[PDB]
Structure prediction request, 1373 residues.
Amino acid sequence: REAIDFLRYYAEQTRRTLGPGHGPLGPIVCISPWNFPLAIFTGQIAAALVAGNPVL
Amino acid sequence: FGGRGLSGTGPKAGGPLYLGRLVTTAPVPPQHSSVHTDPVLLDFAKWLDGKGARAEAEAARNAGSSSALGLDLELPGPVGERNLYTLHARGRILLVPATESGLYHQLAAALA
Amino acid sequence: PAPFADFAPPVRPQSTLRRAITAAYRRPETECLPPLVEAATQSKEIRDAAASTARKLIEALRGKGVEGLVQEYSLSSQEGVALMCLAEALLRIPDTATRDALIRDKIADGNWKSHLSRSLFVNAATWGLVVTGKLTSTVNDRSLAAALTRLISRCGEPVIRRGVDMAMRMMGEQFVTGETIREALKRSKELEEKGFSYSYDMLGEAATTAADAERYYRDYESAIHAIGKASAGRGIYEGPGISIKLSALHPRYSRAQAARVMGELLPRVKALALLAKNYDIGLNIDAEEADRLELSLDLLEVLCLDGDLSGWNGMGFVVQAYGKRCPFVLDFIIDLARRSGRRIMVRLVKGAYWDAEIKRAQLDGLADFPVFTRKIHTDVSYIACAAKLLAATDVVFPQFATHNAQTLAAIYHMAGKDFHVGKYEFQCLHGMGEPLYEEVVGRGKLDRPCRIYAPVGTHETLLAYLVRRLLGANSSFVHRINDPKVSIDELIADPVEVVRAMPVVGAKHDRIALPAELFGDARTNSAGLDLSNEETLASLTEALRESAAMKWTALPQLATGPAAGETRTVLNPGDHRDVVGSVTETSEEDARRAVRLAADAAPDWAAVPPSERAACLDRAAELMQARMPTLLGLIIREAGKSALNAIAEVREAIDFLRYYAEQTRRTLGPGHGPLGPIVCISPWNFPLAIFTGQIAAALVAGNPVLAKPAEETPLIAAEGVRILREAGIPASALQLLPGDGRVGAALVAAAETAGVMFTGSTEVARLIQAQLADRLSPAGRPIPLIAETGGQNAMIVDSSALAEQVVGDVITSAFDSAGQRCSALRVLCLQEDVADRILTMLKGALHELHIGRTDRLSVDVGPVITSEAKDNIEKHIERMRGLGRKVEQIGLASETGVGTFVPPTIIELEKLSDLQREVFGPVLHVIRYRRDDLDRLVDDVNATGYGLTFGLHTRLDETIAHVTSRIKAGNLYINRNIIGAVVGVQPFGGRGLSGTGPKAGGPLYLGRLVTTAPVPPQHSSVHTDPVLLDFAKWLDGKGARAEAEAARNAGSSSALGLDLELPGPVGERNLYTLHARGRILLVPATESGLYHQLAAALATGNSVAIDAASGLQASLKNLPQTVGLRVSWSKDWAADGPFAGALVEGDAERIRAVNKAIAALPGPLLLVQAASSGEIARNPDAYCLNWLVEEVSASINTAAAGGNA
Ligand SMILES: Cc1cc2nc3c(=O)[nH]c(=O)nc-3n(C[C@H](O)[C@H](O)[C@H](O)COP(=O)(O)OP(=O)(O)OC[C@H]3O[C@@H](n4cnc5c(N)ncnc54)[C@H](O)[C@@H]3O)c2cc1C
Prediction:
């Protein structure tokens, strides 16, 4: 559920905020832990992706 | 979710400042504003006016207005719970200026 | 001239029909409804038929703008409001190509702020209503600025373009029919061809100056020509007409100014009507506030009887069905139509001022409302009045203005089958009612005509009252037809049958308080008097005349009986030929005897249980209420007050009596022993209310009182004492000692005087302070002094404020009571971009004031109290004039020669510091400020050292937050005048040079008048000062365990941070908060005493200055930085001030010595608390935390945007 929530939350935050002047950083390295191996994994990746950055 | 000090850098995950850190110009998050103006920022702006540092005084007043310090929101959630989100001062900010005008702008940002 | 012989004569003798109107003014709602229900009743067959027609109309309305924009660009509510505000501002750019360039090149590229002295969001409350349907009194301009930046950065130029085009259509085609009458007339041809007609509303309203009324006249005259030319002989039923508001045509349109209205406003309406007659068009008189209804009837009567207007039936008049007088007004108008033979056009409406009528009746303490309190009652009233109108179509032309399809259907079937054009019509609002009435007009529908009420005006004009026009309320029909939660069956419900079947027909709304019940179970509100009610004016006229025939006296009323002395007369300040009465002044020996008598009787009065002492006060309030008309006449003639201000003063005295009685019943027990004899010294400017309040508080707290009234106004004081004694206060508990400062000084100096309550000048208060510092109580403690003194009160106005509203509040604040209020507005601060416009309006409004002897209702401003006050005030004005400052003064009539008058005066200053003394008269000073310098201006206001009342006019939350957080004043007022603080609602009292506190009419007041203070109602705080907490940890680190525990107990017992909303009228929020006082002077003797003093001061939020002569510096080594920030040491106390209070430790002689040194400090009179070392060890309450916090009252007008959410 937390993974789903991160995806939908950062999707909605994007729809509320990002326009052409909010340029991406570029490649983002996302390093996640073993204790929330889907939720934190998904949240960091979803946020970097939806902001326009490719993710490692 | 997320903390201060040895607990992390922020901004909080699953909160409205998060995406702004992943772009080179941060947007204005939803509901991110405050009607409060730091009173020390105000005193600094008047001091800058006294010195004739007009561009800096203007930048200080603009920082005092656009600061979201004192934001205090209730977030939608389940019944039987009250979920609150507030923005406070961070602490002491390290300023590393190169020029006098740069120092004035940095002070304005931190005081506001 | 005989007193009150010309007080308020009616325009004409009141006919039987006019008397029935006045009789209904505030009739109980249970009495109004049954006859309306009976008159609105229709047959079962007609009710079924009407339900069917209304269902049919509502079916089409539901099967047929900003919302599509919000959807297309996924805007939040704040983004939609911000966008519409941006669009409005872009539309203020006249040239299209320039505007489009700003959008494309500079706005859409961000940094909208750089390109657009006035907030973008001044009108956001109005757009908020458009976008969200909800009303906000003030604007969160920081939220809107964030939303605007977000939406522009997200969607760019396309959303700006759509917003501009949307705003252009709404403001140019929907909220108005057109920007000018010519454009409105061109756009009316479409619907006239379909069977509609038009009435044009030139959006004129509430003239403030003669020049404004002149502009409104020529605007109406020019529209009449354009409409009459366009009408081209179509006549008053087929062709267009005009609607006017009488308040647009004269700046003093009120019953109080009825003579000016009949002499100056009437000929202007006649000249417009003569032009409407020549073109043969309708001229409708719109209905306004309830207190203007009957005055407007006097103009309607003269016009309908004027032979010069004969032959024309175009004159029209609005009647509001939400008003209790509506059927009786209609009876009167129908009779007038019969007598004059003019077929009066009667526009029946529900009414547009409902929220305002509720608030006004509550503020004025009147018996009831002049409007209904349940929407369904107004609906029944409308249908009943339609039945009366439809029975008189031969002599009047009814015009049923309504968007409610149920109301429409009921009237359509009530009118029956016979119809011809000219029999009656419906009416609707432009851009609102056409949907409904396109199902009505024409042979294919109901074949009944509809006249469109068509606003005409620019964007500026339209926006000024758009809020009122939208109120859109949850109960409104158009809100419900567009609410999916409401079925058709709910919409076609018969309000007559719903009301008929309610348990109590016509019961008041459960959630609206009658004015008497504003405070619920706590106490009974005082009742006022309606000076727009002819019966009240006639009865008051007789009482005032009878009051001037009484031989008023004031004598030294000692415990043993009246005493002899030097007797002289008391003169009316407006006319020294009018002798009001005689005063016998007290000898210094008898004043000293009086204190000893009070001392001897103190145990007996202290033994009367607090409840019974409070019963005395409640009995006195009842007596003053019943005697108000007689008290009015005395106050008018002795103190020079207007009748309006005298009513408020008697109300205040009643409120003080009832408030302190209730506070006594809430608090006082056997452990709160009285101080002893208390000397009460009261001023001449509120000679009954402040006099009563000080004496009532001291008495109900168990103290015997020596009452020293101002030398100028002993008569009302003597009458006050008479009433208190009649109410049961024994003569030994309340002695009256008339006389000058010798009497006051003898009383203050008497050894048995245990406390002094003083209201007056700072100069005298400082002399009393020095006298008292000579003495100690028998317990060896300072004599308490409550000293309430003047203020140099300011109002700050920014470019978002509404000029008309500002000017009215400024005129009232500065010149009411000839500026002889402690709260009066002395300095007006105008943002530079609007200063010239507001000053022009202010000067014009100044010259509309009537100055003279106050025994006429028409007088706005009376005399100043003495020739000495006059000379002092005029010397100031001439100094300012001699310095080249601009000085505006109204000319005075020759009759003022027999009294002491100062004309209301406006003086334009360069800097606030140009004003170097308090000027206690009708003298307003004006300064201008640049917006960026607002924070410095507040600094300048604070720097005077005064801190009584302060006003702010702004719509912007950021400016409200800033200014109210930085200003240092006891009574704050937002978007209203700054005078007339209401007991228990705006507890009154300032800081600094303005007073010691505690606030009069507030919950800390009685506790100052007993040896051990009680816990006031609601007096607590869950907040703990964090510097106090740091100090308590430091004390524990030093091993001072007992002190550390006392510090934590002080942190919990402090009420710093209390934040309450006080009950009061609707449309206002009244807040009461406890803040730190400032820097407290600490004069310790021992290390432990210092620690206890520091804890008390820190727990209440204060900084401290510790006497360096104590030698206790080594007692505070290694203080935490947070505590060090609040601690200073002082060798020269006078140099390190001002202080906000003091704590002293010592034996009796040390306390007396320190108390004298404190009294010699320049500036504010310090509230000093003293204790011995042993007392600090034995009594945890040795220092009382009540006196280490500052009370702040804030009153916010939440109706200021044009309505009450
Ligand atoms: C053509 C035209 C001309 C008008 N001229 C004037 C004018 O000169 N003067 C004037 O004062 N107004 C005027 N009005 C406004 C009118 O008085 C109504 O208030 C408004 O138009 C709505 O009434 P309704 O029958 O359309 O809608 P409804 O939803 O049926 O009625 C709403 C009305 O109910 C009343 N009401 C709401 N709440 C309560 C309550 N709690 N207790 C008692 N009553 C309540 C109010 O009067 C409110 O306006 C005019 C309206 C029109 C269309």
Notes: The two ends of chain C are 49 Å apart (CA to CA). Chain C touches chain B through 25 residues (CB under 8 Å). The first strand of chain C starts at residue 196 and ends at 201.
